Every structure is written in structure tokens, then in C-alpha cells.
Amino acid sequence: GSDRPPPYVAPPSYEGPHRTLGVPLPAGWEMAKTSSGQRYFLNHNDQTTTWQDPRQTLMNSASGPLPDGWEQAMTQDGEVYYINHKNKTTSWLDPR
């Protein structure tokens, strides 16, 4: 299949189980792991990293929610994706 580019690697299909985050991470944030598997967070908005769950950035207050009908979830490998229940789709792109 070298004549075609590598296939798109999609998020988990809409139908099936999802490890949803009850409260989504704020837009522009990412979760990662250290080499020993310690969880930490990246704020791409102000280009910082921190141990503290956003749910040097001051995060007192509630952040922008997903639009109605959407949820944030995480793959087994820790990759965040977005579930749109309105049209039964999933996407790597944050709709906020």
C-alpha cells in the first residue's frame, strides 16, 4: 500500500465504549505522562506544564464547556478525542 499515503488513524468509533471525562479539560490543554508514567498537563495556550489538573496558569474558575451534545474522552493510550452525539461521530478536533 505504499502507493497510497498511510491511512488516517481515527479516534475510537462512535459506537462502542468510551472512557469519557466527566468534566472536559479546558480548550488547548493536553494530558501527558513522564517517562515513569507520572501524569501531568500541558497548557498550549500559555505554553506551560504542571502537575495540577486544570479542572503557572491560574485556573480558579469554570472553563468553556463543550457544545451541547458533545463529550470529551480519552483513548487507552491517553489521547484525548471528542464525541458528537448529535450526528454520532468522533473527532480528534476540539469543537470549542
Author numbering: 134 to 188, 207 to 247
Can I see the authors' text?
WW domains organize molecular assemblies by binding to short, proline rich peptide motifs each with ~4–6 residues. The type I WW domains bind to a consensus ‘PPxY’ motif (where P is proline, x is any amino acid and Y is tyrosine, also known as PY-motif) with very modest affinities (with Kd in the range of a few to a few tens of µM). To achieve this goal, we determined the high resolustion structures of 7 representative WW tandem/target complexes, and measured the binding constants of >100 WW domain tandems or isolated WW domains binding to known or previously unknown targets. In this study, we discovered that WW tandems, but not individual WW domains, can bind to target proteins with extremely high affinity and with very high sequence specificity.
We were able to obtain high diffraction quality crystals when the Dendrin PY23 sequence was fused to either the N- or C-termini of the YAP WW tandem. We solved the structures of these two versions of the complex. Although each WW domain engages the ‘PPxY’ motif following the canonical type I WW/target bindings, the overall structure of the YAP WW tandem/Dendrin PY23 complex differs substantially from those of the KIBRA/MAGI2 WW tandems in complex with the same ligand in two distinct aspects. First, the inter-domain linker of the YAP WW tandem is unstructured and there is no C-terminal helix following YAP WW2. Thus, the two WW domains of YAP do not form a supramodule due to very limited inter-domain contact. This is supported by the two versions of the complex structures solved, in which the inter-domain orientations are obviously different. Second, the Dendrin PY23 binds to the YAP WW tandem in a parallel orientation (i.e. PY2 binds to WW1 and PY3 binds to WW2), instead of the antiparallel binding orientation observed for the KIBRA/MAGI2 WW tandems. This is again likely attributed by the lack of inter-domain interactions between the two WW domains of YAP so that each domain can freely choose its more preferred PY-motif. In contrast, the coupling between WW1 and WW2 in YAP is minimal. Therefore, the target binding synergism between the two WW domains in the YAP tandem is also low. For example, the binding of YAP WW tandem to Dendrin PY23 is only a few tens tighter than the isolated WW domains, and this relatively low synergism likely originates from the very closely spaced PY-motifs of Dendrin PY23.
